[PDB]
Amino acid sequence: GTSKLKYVLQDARFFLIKSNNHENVSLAKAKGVWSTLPVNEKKLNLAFRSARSVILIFSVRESGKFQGFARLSSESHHGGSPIHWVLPAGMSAKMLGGVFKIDWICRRELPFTKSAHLTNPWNEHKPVKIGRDGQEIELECGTQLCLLFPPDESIDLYQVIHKM
Numbered sequence: 001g002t003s004k005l006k007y008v009l010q011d012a013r014f015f016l017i018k019s020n021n022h023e024n025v026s027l028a029k030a031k032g033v034w035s036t037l038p039v040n041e042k043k044l045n046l047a048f049r050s051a052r053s054v055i056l057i058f059s060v061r062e063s064g065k066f067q068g069f070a071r072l073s074s075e076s077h078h079g080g081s082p083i084h085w086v087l088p089a090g091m092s093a094k095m096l097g098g099v100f101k102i103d104w105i106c107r108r109e110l111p112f113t114k115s116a117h118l119t120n121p122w123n124e125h126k127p128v129k130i131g132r133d134g135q136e137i138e139l140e141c142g143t144q145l146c147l148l149f150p151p152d153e154s155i156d157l158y159q160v161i162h163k164m
């Protein structure tokens with residue numbers, strides 16, 4: 001069912017995350033981590049202290065889909081185990097901010113065709129698929145977007161709830 005998911009999303013904040021490729025989303029799904037550029041790192045750290053849940057909704061560039069969504073479990077930190085991200089041309093690992101721990105809520109994909117009825121007030125009511133990395137998605141739009149994803153029966157939200 002969807003009741004524990006709705007509980008996790010209650011009064012959450014939501015951010016669109018772009019990945020240049022599928023490899024980085026695969027690494028994020030396996031290791032429970034993400035890293036963004038410093039401008040977005042500052043926004044996410046502020047949000048993490050501001051709200052009961054901060055949800056990252058992932059989309060690989062040019063894929064026409066979202067690849068899942070996850071909840072921040074920490075502010076960003078430096079000096080942890082190395083992660084062999086595959087970054088875009090002209091970007092080095094030193095340009096990244098720190099590493100956020102994340103707990104995946106759904107590792108299933110959602111094609112953009114299924115979200116065409118949702119618009120984001122914080123991006124001029126453009127379709128929610130449209131946005132730069134780090135674009136905040138307003139609560140109602142973000143909640144409805146997450147509820148569109150296929151249920152991920154491999155995930156037990158009981159432990160995620162205990163972190164809130």
Ligand SMILES: O=c1cc(C2CC2)[nH]c(=O)n1-c1ccccc1
Nearest residue numbers: 018019020024035036037085133
């Ligand atoms: O492409 C990537 C790949 C990553 C991986 C470390 C996780 N993190 C990012 O933030 N980007 C990004 C998105 C939009 C604009 C500039 C960079």
